[PDB]
Ligand SMILES: O[C@@H]1[C@@H](O)[C@H](O[C@@H]2CO[C@@H](O[C@@H]3CO[C@@H](O[C@@H]4CO[C@H](F)[C@H](O)[C@H]4O)[C@H](O)[C@H]3O)[C@H](O)[C@H]2O)OC[C@H]1O
Ligand SMILES: O[C@@H]1[C@@H](O)[C@H](O[C@@H]2CO[C@H](F)[C@H](O)[C@H]2O)OC[C@H]1O
Ligand SMILES: [Cl-]
Ligand SMILES: [Cl-]
Ligand SMILES: [Zn+2]
Ligand SMILES: [Zn+2]
């Protein structure tokens with residue numbers, strides 16, 4: 008948008024949450040250590056009114072051994088949010104990653120997926136579903152009065168448009184999804200909001216598979232209030248028109264929509280990253296700002312269907328996208344960023360992405376000015 012506008016400190020800038028406070032909340036994903044960091048704390052107080060745990064509320068973080076519950080890190084995030092009037096999202100009750108393996112072992116310690124006896128398979132389904140309910144019950148009984156929004160399940164639809172064939176699904180079938188939502192509603196009451204969260208919600212055949220799944224579950228009386236759109240997107244993909252079609256499609260079923268992990272990568276897929284932040288050309292920041300301009304204009308257009316937009320991080324000095332920031336080198340040792348160009352070797356996850364509206368020195372980017380204005 009406006010590259011003339013200055014690279015001032017974000018702690019001096021107009022508040023992002025206040026700009027959008029009638030359209031949707033503005034959230035950030037955080038780690039407990041960031042609440043010990045003065046700049047991060049100042050950023051959260053100044054610009055955000057919603058919060059989510061990047062990692063410490065995932066299944067392996069909460070119950071890494073059966074009966075061993077570690078709420079100490081999650082509590083710190085809940086405490087900070089309460090002290091600053093922030094909404095809280097719980098990420099996440101059910102997932103196929105960062106999930107403890109003990110869930111999926113039979114009574115003799117052997118993987119349930121290997122069982123061939125159909126009578127024992129059914130016993131394993133019931134054992135897994137009981138473990139599921141106990142995990143959800145313990146968490147929700149603790150946090151039901153503090154956490155309004157819940158990622159009940161994460162990434163349960165595969166990119167091929169079939170249900171993801173995770174151990175959850177191989178062992179228990181579709182019922183693990185139904186049990187997760189029923190348990191959350193039972194122990195949390197009617198006032199918490201239950202979400203199905205996923206990436207590439209805009210992309211077929213996954214989009215229609217997600218649509219049909221939640222449609223059928225609601226018809227069977229499974230409580231589900233909304234869809235979480237992770238929105239791990241690029242400067243040019245997916246198109247705004249497909250984002251709009253996706254949001255409207257789910258709103259037509261009576262579901263809320265939340266943007267739950269927004270980042271706008273500088274790269275494509277698979278990414279060919281620059282090795283450092285300093286190496287990223289200025290022009291990339293301007294392409295990103297125009298994309299952010301279009302994207303938030305669309306979010307505002309649809310504000311009656313979106314209750315929250317959460318970024319998967321605070322500022323560019325910390326983003327999980329760096330773990331995807333592969334750097335390609337040609338035979339002369341020069342960096343290759345052209346996605347079809349020749350190259351000799353790749354250094355996986357050693358580069359730098361730049362996905363937010365706040366730079367790594369906590370100063371506002373062109374993308375910030377692009378979304379703080381009313382043009
Ligand atoms: O663990 C998950 C992790 O898997 C997830 O990563 C996503 C995996 O799917 C990727 O989807 C591809 C994105 O790029 C598209 O191609 C674009 C087409 O349009 C333009 F040409 C553009 O330049 C292209 O890049 C592919 O068709 C998609 O399949 C996503 O990018 C990943 O984010 O992230 C969440 C983790 O929890
Ligand atoms: O620190 C990393 C963390 O940020 C990442 O979180 C996932 C990002 O992709 C989606 F949004 C998932 O739902 C998030 O849970 O997980 C890996 C971890 O190392
Ligand atoms: Cl990370
Ligand atoms: Cl900078
Ligand atoms: Zn505020
Ligand atoms: Zn540097």
Ligand SMILES: [Zn+2]
Pocket residue numbers: 029030031310311312313314315
């Ligand atoms: Zn709204």
Ligand SMILES: [Zn+2]
Pocket residue numbers: 038061325326327
């Ligand atoms: Zn992180």
Ligand SMILES: [Zn+2]
Pocket residue numbers: 014366368370
């Ligand atoms: Zn700077």
Ligand SMILES: [Zn+2]
Pocket residue numbers: 008300376377378379380381382
């Ligand atoms: Zn704008």
